[PDB]
Amino acid sequence: GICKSSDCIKSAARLIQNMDATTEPCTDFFKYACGGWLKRNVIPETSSRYGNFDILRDELEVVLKDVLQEPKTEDIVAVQKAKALYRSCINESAIDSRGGEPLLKLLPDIYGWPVATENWEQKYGASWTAEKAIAQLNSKYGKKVLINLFVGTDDKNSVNHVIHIDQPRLGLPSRDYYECTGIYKEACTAYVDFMISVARLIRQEERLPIDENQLALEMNKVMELEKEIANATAKPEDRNDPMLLYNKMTLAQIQNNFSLEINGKPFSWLNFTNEIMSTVNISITNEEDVVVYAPEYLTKLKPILTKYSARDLQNLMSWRFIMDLVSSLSRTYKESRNAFRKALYGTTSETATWRRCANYVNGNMENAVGRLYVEAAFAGESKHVVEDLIAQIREVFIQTLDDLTWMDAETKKRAEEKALAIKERIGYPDDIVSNDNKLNNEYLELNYKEDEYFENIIQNLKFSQSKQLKKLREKVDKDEWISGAAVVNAFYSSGRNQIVFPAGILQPPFFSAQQSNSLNYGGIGMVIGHEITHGFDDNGRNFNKDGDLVDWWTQQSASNFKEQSQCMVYQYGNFSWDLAGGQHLNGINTLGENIADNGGLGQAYRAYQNYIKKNGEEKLLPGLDLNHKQLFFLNFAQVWCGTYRPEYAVNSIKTDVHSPGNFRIIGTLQNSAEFSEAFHCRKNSYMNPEKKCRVW
Ligand SMILES: C[C@H](NC(=O)[C@H](Cc1ccccc1)CP(=O)(O)[C@H](C)NC(=O)CC[C@H](N)C(=O)N1CCCC1C#N)C(=O)O
Ligand SMILES: *[C@@H]1O[C@H](CO)[C@@H](O)[C@H](O)[C@H]1NC(C)=O
Ligand SMILES: *[C@@H]1O[C@H](CO)[C@@H](O)[C@H](O)[C@H]1NC(C)=O
Ligand SMILES: *[C@@H]1O[C@H](CO)[C@@H](O)[C@H](O)[C@H]1NC(C)=O
Numbered sequence: 252g253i254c255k256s257s258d259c260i261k262s263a264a265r266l267i268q269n270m271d272a273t274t275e276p277c278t279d280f281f282k283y284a285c286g287g288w289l290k291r292n293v294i295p296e297t298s299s300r301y302g303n304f305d306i307l308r309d310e311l312e313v314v315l316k317d318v319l320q321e322p323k324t325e326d327i328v329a330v331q332k333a334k335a336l337y338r339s340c341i342n343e344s345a346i347d348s349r350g351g352e353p354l355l356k357l358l359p360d361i362y363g364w365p366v367a368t369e370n371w372e373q374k375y376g377a378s379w380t381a382e383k384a385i386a387q388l389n390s391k392y393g394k395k396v397l398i399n400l401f402v403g404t405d406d407k408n409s410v411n412h413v414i415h416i417d418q419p420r421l422g423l424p425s426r427d428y429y430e431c432t433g434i435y436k437e438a439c440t441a442y443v444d445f446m447i448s449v450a451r452l453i454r455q456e457e458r459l460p461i462d463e464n465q466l467a468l469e470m471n472k473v474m475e476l477e478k479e480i481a482n483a484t485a486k487p488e489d490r491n492d493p494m495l496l497y498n499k500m501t502l503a504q505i506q507n508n509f510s511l512e513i514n515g516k517p518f519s520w521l522n523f524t525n526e527i528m529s530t531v532n533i534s535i536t537n538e539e540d541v542v543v544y545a546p547e548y549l550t551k552l553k554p555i556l557t558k559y560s561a562r563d564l565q566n567l568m569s570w571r572f573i574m575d576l577v578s579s580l581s582r583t584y585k586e587s588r589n590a591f592r593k594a595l596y597g598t599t600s601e602t603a604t605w606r607r608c609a610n611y612v613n614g615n616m617e618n619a620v621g622r623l624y625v626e627a628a629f630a631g632e633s634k635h636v637v638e639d640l641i642a643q644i645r646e647v648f649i650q651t652l653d654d655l656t657w658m659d660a661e662t663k664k665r666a667e668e669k670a671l672a673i674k675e676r677i678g679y680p681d682d683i684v685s686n687d688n689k690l691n692n693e694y695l696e697l698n699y700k701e702d703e704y705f706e707n708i709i710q711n712l713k714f715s716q717s718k719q720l721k722k723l724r725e726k727v728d729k730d731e732w733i734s735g736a737a738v739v740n741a742f743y744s745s746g747r748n749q750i751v752f753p754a755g756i757l758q759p760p761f762f763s764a765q766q767s768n769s770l771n772y773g774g775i776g777m778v779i780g781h782e783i784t785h786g787f788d789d790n791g792r793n794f795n796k797d798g799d800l801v802d803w804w805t806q807q808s809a810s811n812f813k814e815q816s817q818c819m820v821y822q823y824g825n826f827s828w829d830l831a832g833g834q835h836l837n838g839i840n841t842l843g844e845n846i847a848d849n850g851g852l853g854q855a856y857r858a859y860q861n862y863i864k865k866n867g868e869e870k871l872l873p874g875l876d877l878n879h880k881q882l883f884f885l886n887f888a889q890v891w892c893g894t895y896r897p898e899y900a901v902n903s904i905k906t907d908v909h910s911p912g913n914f915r916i917i918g919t920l921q922n923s924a925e926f927s928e929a930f931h932c933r934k935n936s937y938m939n940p941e942k943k944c945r946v947w
């Protein structure tokens with residue numbers, strides 16, 4: 252009664268090879284599930300993290316290379332364009348011969364980089380303001396500095412777009428880095444050295460005189476600025492509540508509650524907003540509604556910005572763009588990045604050009620590349636089986652509502668309503684294969700030259716920003732996919748109340764029609780549950796069936812949610828991570844992801860039970876002394892076989908809202924009674940704590 256098939260052999264062999272059966276499952280299931288992988292694999296020099304998940308992404312890149320690298324004669328223009336973009340990107344010889352000239356010729360159009368110019372104040376005396384300089388970077392080049400203005404969906408009216416104001420991202424991965432001591436010292440040193448190196452290269456290329464003292468003085472001043480900005484930003488822990496984040500005022504209310512004076516100004520919000528919107532010939536009233544996500548940050552900005560010179564501000568502002576551009580220039584410029592990215596990521600070498608290039612084209616043409624990818628790589632009747640799994644787990648979520656004692660009846664029935672309304676999106680949009688016109692038209696105004704990679708990427712930034720901005724008065728497109736298909740990941744949108752499973756994730760170990768269903772449910776089953784449960788985590792629970800930010804909870808249930816979930820904040824908050832130097836996880840910042848994991852795996856397990864019930868026990872896998880309950884958990888865990896560079900562990904513990912793979916497994920399975928059954932775990936077994944968290 253062993254399954255003997257081709258596909259069973261492959262599955263079994265992968266499971267066997269990953270696991271370490273000399274470890275007690277009940278002491279450390281991660282080591283049990285993954286210890287074999289961990290012995291045999293080192294992290295590649297180009298990887299900051301590595302494991303079964305990242306291997307799928309490497310393998311997807313190979314597919315993208317195959318489909319992009321050879322011109323075909325039947326290729327529609329949209330595909331011609333992805334291929335030409337790929338070609339421009341992989342031509343290092345062309346790129347190296349251009350030096351930094353493409354940057355140099357760009358710099359004027361963003362009001363310069365003063366450290367890298369002569370007499371900067373006099374050049375731009377006539378023209379420069381903070382309003383204009385921020386707005387050009389934002390609107391033509393999509394770089395958000397000092398103040399992030401962006402058109403997005405209205406949280407409280409999901410069918411419309413509003414202007415948003417928010418705090419900007421920083422040059423370093425999180426606000427914590429700007430302590431610049433201990434585990435953060437090298438990053439800060441490398442960061443500022445990086446600035447200096449690039450300022451030097453630009454000067455040398457312009458044939459200007461180099462004063463190392465002045466360079467250090469101006470870039471250290473840049474760092475002090477950003478340090479202050481970093482300290483002014485709101486913590487993530489204070490940004491978790493979408494109701495608190497949503498403060499809609501008019502540009503007038505903003506002008507008068509959030510004044511800034513820059514270089515002796517003061518700052519005209521009306522003017523700022525219009526310098527951006529005019530890019531696309533739209534005109535804005537002082538009476539325009541704006542959703543301000545970062546009130547206290549704007550308030551805290553006031554005393555900081557006054558202190559600094561125009562020269563300081565623009566030194567930071569241009570640096571933040573130039574940062575992103577150097578690796579698209581010649582080798583010498585690429586090289587200047589090295590210590591910075593090692594410090595942040597642990598990597599000692601650049602990822603292969605063809606991989607970076609394939610990823611870049613995919614990022615900018617995800618429908619064209621998605622089309623090519625699915626033609627190569629993706630079945631057909633996968634779509635329908637997954638459709639079935641999603642039916643099943645949606646129904647399990649609903650069903651579970653009755654067992655759940657921390658909600659009252661109106662709230663439970665509201666949760667049901669939201670559950671039923673969730674719109675699923677599987678594999679890829681038919682559109683991109685069966686409608687050539689529509690796919691050509693998406694990229695109509697794009698025109699790439701194969702010798703002009705840098706102009707190509709600049710074109711993409713301009714086009715991207717212009718499209719986004721002109722959405723202000725347009726309605727949100729219900730049908731539009733929020734991911735390309737060539738993506739190893741899955742998604743929930745609170746705004747669309749939508750779950751999304753790109754073709755890229757619908758493969759082993761998550762899914763195959765030919766692998767055991769224990770594996771499918773423990774794999775993709777648990778992913779579906781994770782995405783659905785995002786609809787009901789500490790963010791998503793705040794949005795209703797239509798994607799609108801609206802309270803549908805009673806005070807009691809709202810309070811009980813918080814109380815139930817506080818258990819997981821404490822639990823994961825209590826994990827210490829060696830790779831990050833013994834630091835504890837942020838149990839608050841990972842909560843939503845942790846809630847989704849625990850809910851998700853529960854739901855998937857119960858759906859598999861409902862399946863075994865109706866259909867029967869399935870045949871065992873050869874070479875494995877486990878039953879299918881046990882394999883279910885085995886596979887769920889092996890999704891996350893892998894490990895981290897210490898430099899990236901320090902990064903991720905602050906910037907990833909997901910727990911690290913190992914703690915995802917331990918966390919969730921500590922909360923699973925079913926797991927402890929399956930592996931016969933003693934009470935107070937490390938893997939079977941007596942006290943367990945439960946939300947969903
Ligand atoms: C591999 C890893 N992915 C993940 O764990 C899961 C997939 C997974 C699950 C289980 C095992 C392995 C992989 C994806 P995921 O849901 O985490 C996704 C990146 N996240 C989202 O879809 C966002 C959530 C939610 N929609 C949300 O935050 N929203 C929606 C509207 C605005 C807003 C905000 N703020 C990863 O991406 O690192
Ligand atoms: C790279 O670009 C240069 C442009 O100077 C061109 O001469 C060469 O043929 C290109 N190489 C490839 C492989 O496209
Ligand atoms: C914004 O103000 C500047 C200040 O000089 C002015 O020159 C410019 O025309 C204004 N732009 C808009 C969009 O009103
Ligand atoms: C660890 O758990 C205890 C007990 O709930 C809690 O008081 C403590 O704050 C937790 N540690 C963290 C950082 O979450």
Ligand SMILES: [Zn+2]
Pocket residue numbers: 781785844847
């Ligand atoms: Zn998630």
